[PDB]
């Protein structure tokens, strides 16, 4: 019964080509609901889900001012980190921020997250206790001491347990019809003989939400972890997700294998046989 | 809602 709200920020420096590229997105669970693109014409925080469109002009003015402020922050962070690491002014670098909060089954605050990354590597992260930081190197130690000086973990824990969860609850009740739904996966199998030596069984799971799913193959009850291909859970484009798991089988033994699908939308895990 | 604070690295 856990629910989450996340904000993702990506800033990429374009040296000698103007300002950095800034893109922000907000998620509730696996549903995107806001976006902002530095290069878009609107220069505004835009809706990407119906249940957020009902918010008033104060909300969108506010989130636009804040997201532009985070755009400025990351712009400065690119120059700052370039200094920390003594890097040339000609290379293009990337700062990424991610922060949000989780509420539990009782709809109270459960967990908080807030962390940065430079060029795809961890820079600094807020620890689970929401009171201390994790610094990977000298540069991150600098930031850590700066934030420790300004009591950042205090203001941030106050936000994560306050405004963050309050409006996560508001979004969950406004988007009750879609955010609190559960689309169970539609499943089936396919068989493609790659030879007389062996054939390919493929187990399909389609149109399911949320994206958390588990697919396993079994040969006579034992787990076929090896000889099993597993594809990455991909988006369908309509708000649902897809995933398939394939296994190679000697011809004539297709009835010996079994696909087991596990998803929170199913009351009992599914068992699929080629018999 | 986003966090109000400006937080620099």
């Amino acid at each position, epitope marked *: 019964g856990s629910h989450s709200m996340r904000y993702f920020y990506t800033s990429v420096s374009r040296p000698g080509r103007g300002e950095p590229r800034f893109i922000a997105v907000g998620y509730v669970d696996d549903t995107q609901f806001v976006r902002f693109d530095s290069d878009a014409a609107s220069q505004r925080m835009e809706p990407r889900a119906p249940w957020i469109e009902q918010e008033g002009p104060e909300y969108w003015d506010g989130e636009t001012r*804040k997201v532009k402020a985070h755009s400025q922050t990351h*712009r400065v962070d690119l120059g700052t980190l370039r200094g920390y690491y003594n890097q040339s002014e000609a290379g293009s670098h990337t700062v990424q921020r991610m922060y949000g909060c989780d509420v539990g089954s009782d709809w109270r605050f459960l967990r908080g997250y807030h962390q940065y990354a430079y060029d795809g590597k961890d820079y600094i992260a807020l620890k689970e206790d929401l009171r201390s930081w994790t610094a990977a190197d000298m540069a991150a130690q600098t930031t850590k001491h700066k934030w420790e000086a300004a009591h950042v973990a*205090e203001q941030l824990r106050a*936000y994560l347990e*306050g*405004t963050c969860v309050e409006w996560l609850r508001r979004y969950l009740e406004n988007g009750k019809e879609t955010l609190q739904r559960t689309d169970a996966p539609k499943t089936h199998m396919t068989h493609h003989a790659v030879s007389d030596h062996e054939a390919t069984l493929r187990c399909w799971a389609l149109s399911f939400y949320p994206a958390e799913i588990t697919l396993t193959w079994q040969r006579d009850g034992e787990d076929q972890t090896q000889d099993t291909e597993l594809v990455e859970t991909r988006p369908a484009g309509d708000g649902t997700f897809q995933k398939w798991a394939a296994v190679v089988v000697p011809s004539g033994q297709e009835q010996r294998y079994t696909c087991h699908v596990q998803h929170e939308g199913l009351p009992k895990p599914l068992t699929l046989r080629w018999e | 809602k986003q966090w109000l604070v*400006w937080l620099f690295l």
Partner: antibody
Amino acid sequence: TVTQSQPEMSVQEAETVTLSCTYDTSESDYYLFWYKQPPSRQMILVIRQEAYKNRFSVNFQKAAKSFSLKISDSQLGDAAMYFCAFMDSNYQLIWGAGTKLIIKP
Amino acid sequence: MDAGVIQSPRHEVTEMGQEVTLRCKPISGHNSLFWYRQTMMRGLELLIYFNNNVPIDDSGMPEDRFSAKMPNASFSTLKIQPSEPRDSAVYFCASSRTSPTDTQYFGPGTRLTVLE
């Protein structure tokens, strides 16, 4: 908007005076400030208070939206124009009308 | 250093049509710079404020008569060209360490009187 009800106040030296200030905003995270401007025109901060948390102190009532400045043991050097300020997602100081504090020796 | 926010000139008396240049050097480690002006009728008015030399908000700036710039982290300038009597005011420069939410420290101000 910030409201400082009485635009002027007189207090006897070595006595305590309380300047009222109330604001009105829907936004859920904000900042409050008390600034002081003597006749020298030099704006100086007196007290800062964030929403989540000397002779000068403040009664901060989040319920009634009250941010009152309290000066105990008035000193002649406190006579000045006291402004109550407030900031939200607009990231711009929003100024009250101001209260002129006069200290009678 | 004996220093906070620094403004020059302290006073400026000039005639209309003349160019007016106000200079400000913020506190050393401060990255946000603010331009205010104060009058009797209108009170305090935020004209423009920068952060890390980037102009964040200039909505308080009048149009095509006022222009502010900040070429260094340690210097900003506000220019009125041409000046008019209605510009008469006390233009304050302020600064803060990192963001507009941080305590702002104000300068002594420039007393501008544009006469007819």
